[PDB]
Amino acid sequence: QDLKAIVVGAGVIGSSVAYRLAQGGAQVTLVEADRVGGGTSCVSYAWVNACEKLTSHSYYKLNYAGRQAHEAILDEFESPAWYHRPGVLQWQHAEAEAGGRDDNDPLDKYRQLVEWGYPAELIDARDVRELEPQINADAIGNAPVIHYPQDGWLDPTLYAGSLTEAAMVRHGLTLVRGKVAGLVVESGRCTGVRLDDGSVLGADAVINCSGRWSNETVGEGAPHVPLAPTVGLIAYTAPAGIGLRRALRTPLVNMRPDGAGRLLLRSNELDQLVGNHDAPALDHPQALELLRRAEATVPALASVGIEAVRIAIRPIPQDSYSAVGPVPNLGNYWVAVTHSGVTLGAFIGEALADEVLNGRPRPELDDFRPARFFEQEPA
Amino acid sequence: DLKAIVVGAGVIGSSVAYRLAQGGAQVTLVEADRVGGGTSCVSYAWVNACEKLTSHSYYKLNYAGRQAHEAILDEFESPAWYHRPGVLQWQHNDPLDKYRQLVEWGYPAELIDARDVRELEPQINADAIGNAPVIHYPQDGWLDPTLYAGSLTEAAMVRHGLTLVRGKVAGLVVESGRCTGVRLDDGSVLGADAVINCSGRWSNETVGEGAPHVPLAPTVGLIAYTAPAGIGLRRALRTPLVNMRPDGAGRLLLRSNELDQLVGNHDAPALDHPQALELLRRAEATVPALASVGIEAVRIAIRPIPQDSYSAVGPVPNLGNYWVAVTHSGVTLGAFIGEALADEVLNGRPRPELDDFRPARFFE
Ligand SMILES: Cc1cc2nc3c(=O)[nH]c(=O)nc-3n(C[C@H](O)[C@H](O)[C@H](O)COP(=O)(O)OP(=O)(O)OC[C@H]3O[C@@H](n4cnc5c(N)ncnc54)[C@H](O)[C@@H]3O)c2cc1C
Ligand SMILES: Cc1cc2nc3c(=O)[nH]c(=O)nc-3n(C[C@H](O)[C@H](O)[C@H](O)COP(=O)(O)OP(=O)(O)OC[C@H]3O[C@@H](n4cnc5c(N)ncnc54)[C@H](O)[C@@H]3O)c2cc1C
């Protein structure tokens, strides 16, 4: 009786899809070529947010539903330690994780945030140090800073590991360490996956959650979602003897606590100087510059060094927006590939579980289906 | 107003400086490297009163340290440095004897078995436990001592005017048998009414040739830190093969007393250090879901003394206005030592809980 579902990829998205499918009664096989949470989800600022999406109201609403889903799922776990919400401070001219530099006036931006219901407040530049006194007074500038007091970041690898553990223990999910090389397709319907050893894993549904590898996973077996990948480098300090509670997104650097005093540092500007295949050396020129910018922002960081550097590729559909759903003329197959995948992961899990188990697409995804990239009329 | 110099900005010095500044002293905190950058940065940091049980007096001191770490949280906004998901502990002296002693003294501990662990942490390999009894400390956890030290130092500066000096103390300034300040390695002098040496394993090196020394028996410790791991583990584990616990965003901290015996004092903390690689293997044997997770960091530190009974926390007899703090369970005791030594310096009231740690006991 039970529907057999294969989820390819165990990142923040695939772990969510697999967990909700298994909870929904499906017999789930999660196929992961590397390790649970070891892909781009391991190299992310991971701000769970809708406030970076003020141009598309429907994309804002999708990201807001993702944010709400991350709060709701915590109730299903014991002592979940993966969603830290101490607040986020965002400057005018800050770079966005979703892309670009935001030069809009903070008061105009705040009016829109209020109208769209996002929890936020403004802080005068001269009052920022009341919240975080170790910020350099010379680094703050003169414009108001947006404070998202209930916002924070995910630990996507810990999240993915916890959901996979629960899916296995509570709902009989199986984890397969293997690399999908293509799909098995019979009469226009996908009937399973083929691994790179030629072995076949049969299923009633296949959900491709392989991130920036989305098209390489299916090869010639499925239509491709056009992608526009970019590289990201993140530097992680040794544990730092500073008091910083909140995430900081200044015109110079994006930085935040990442556990036990460690700091995560990144910059869109510096990403442009990183090659796709650069070695993540601890003395990488952009990692060293990230540390310099962090110390200029918080001078109390003196003598704290870089302990880790990670590099990954962003899954980004060609038009910037999520692609979650079926593709033309291939039954029993779904794909999920998107930027802001941390924000959206939990919601994508419940949305695709509803589609696979009950044939019920969520209305929030209406503007974000893969079909928009293909022919709209019969050829 | 009393002028106090605290040397060393680890978990102990930051606590002493914080409570002294809170108490009205003008505090100068002198740190040669960085706040929280010493042994406090390389610690399992279990806040506990159950390791290496000896006397009820030693338990009461460690328990007061544990309670002080909970109480201090109320003085800070959203403190993120004390994680209490529970601790699980099993061996291959006797664990029942230890469990019974802890229950009799009132410590929150429970005796469970491998089937109970399967419910709490299902990704632990049952083979790693066997039929051994398991002690669960359900309200216990660990500190982030570097984040703690940085937060207390920030608060002391903002709220109470503490000054932080990046400098290396080379000796004490003494006038007619009384300490009147410190001398830095550039020859400059910082004067004060009281000096509290909280330089950890560097305690004797800090004061140099013209000041008293306390006994030390140093040993080396290595800790390996994994990249973020896709496992669900909530609790800290203390097992026969490895002590391992979450350390942030999925990272795991790994260490072992047995493997520490094979580490040299000046070993480079290489990511492929032979004992770091063996720690990773033992961690995967304990939690097989750790497959393909690698080592991301390795840190090495020196412990000044191997057991709590070697500790020297209090005034030093042959020199006035001078205190020292050398501990074994420095994370557990840090907050309490802060309030205890602040009380001595400000009010001349030595806490009786520190009586067994008096440095004067080493001088006849
Ligand atoms: C620097 C940076 C900062 C970011 N900041 C944010 C932020 O603040 N907020 C936000 O919401 N998003 C942010 N993101 C985006 C977010 O991190 C990603 O969108 C998200 O992690 C993608 O998740 P995923 O599960 O789709 O991909 P992944 O985590 O990469 O998971 C895909 C998995 O598929 C596996 N796989 C691949 N090919 C195969 C195969 N053939 N067979 C089997 N398994 C396979 C891989 O091993 C991998 O584990 C950021 C991204 C970057 C790079
Ligand atoms: C592997 C390991 C595991 C541990 N696990 C636990 C545990 O589970 N529970 C527990 O309670 N404890 C534990 N401990 C013990 C605990 O970590 C230490 O006792 C504690 O961190 C010591 O703090 P401290 O402030 O005294 O020393 P430190 O943190 O070393 O601080 C001393 C400071 O003095 C500075 N300094 C040195 N010389 C000078 C100078 N001349 N001038 C100025 N500054 C100077 C140094 O730079 C340093 O920052 C563990 C220790 C180790 C090594």
Could you outline the blueprint of secondary structure elements for this entry?
The structure is a homodimer.
Chain A: E1 4-8, H1 12-23, E2 27-32, E3 47-48, H2 57-73, E4 83-84, E5 88-90, H3 106-115, E6 121-123, H4 128-131, E7 145-148, E8 152-154, H5 156-171, E9 174-177, E10 180-186, E11 189-195, E12 200-202, E13 205-208, H6 214-218, E14 230-237, E15 247-249, E16 254-259, E17 262-266, H7 268-271, H8 285-297, E18 306-314, E19 323-325, E20 333-337, H9 341-358
Parallel strand pairs in A: 1-2, 1-13, 2-9, 5-15, 13-20
Antiparallel strand pairs in A: 3-8, 4-8, 5-7, 6-7, 10-11, 11-12, 14-17, 14-18, 15-16, 16-17, 19-20
Bound molecules: flavin-adenine dinucleotide (2 copies).
PDB class: flavoprotein
Keywords: Opine, Nopaline, Glycine oxidase family, flavoprotein
Assembly: dimeric
